[PDB]
């Protein structure tokens, strides 16, 4: 950092812990034909 | 009975004498209150300092 004037400076050192988390692997995409509904749009469903 | 501007000549000498009396001469008169003033007619930010 740059110090040019008297005073009190508070800085945070980046040294620490940065945990890495997993990802969800339970999503599937089905392509098919249906009688009625949105066309060419990847709709999201979570219950019948 | 009016306010007017004067140079800071005697006040710094008084501050130096006070610092030399209360503490040793090795203490830098860096943080002392200019007892007696009212205003400054100018403001300094961090960058200007």
């Amino acid at each position: 950092p740059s110090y040019l004037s008297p005073g009190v400076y508070v800085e945070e050192v980046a040294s620490g812990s940065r945990p890495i988390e997993g990802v969800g692997t339970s999503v599937a995409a089905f392509v098919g034909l249906a009688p009625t509904g949105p066309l060419n749009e990847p709709t999201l469903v979570t219950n019948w | 009975g009016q306010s007017r501007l004067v140079p800071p000549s005697g006040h710094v000498a008084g501050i130096w004498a006070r610092n030399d009396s209360e503490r040793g001469v090795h203490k830098a008169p860096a943080n002392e209150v200019v007892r007696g003033a009212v205003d400054l007619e100018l403001q300094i930010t961090r960058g200007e300092q």
Binding site: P6, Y9, V13, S15, G16 | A30
Partner: protein, 40 residues
């Protein structure tokens, strides 16, 4: 320091005393810096 090492006979012939003195002064603290780091 004031001894025969800093006062050779040639110097003391002319009547000279040196008495070398060295001190270490103190300086004011102007910039105060903290860190505030996170550790395990």
């Amino acid at each position: 320091k004031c001894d025969e090492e800093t006062n050779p006979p040639e110097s003391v012939d002319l009547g000279r005393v040196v008495c070398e003195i060295g001190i270490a002064p103190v300086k004011p603290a102007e910039f105060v810096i903290f860190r505030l780091a996170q550790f395990s």
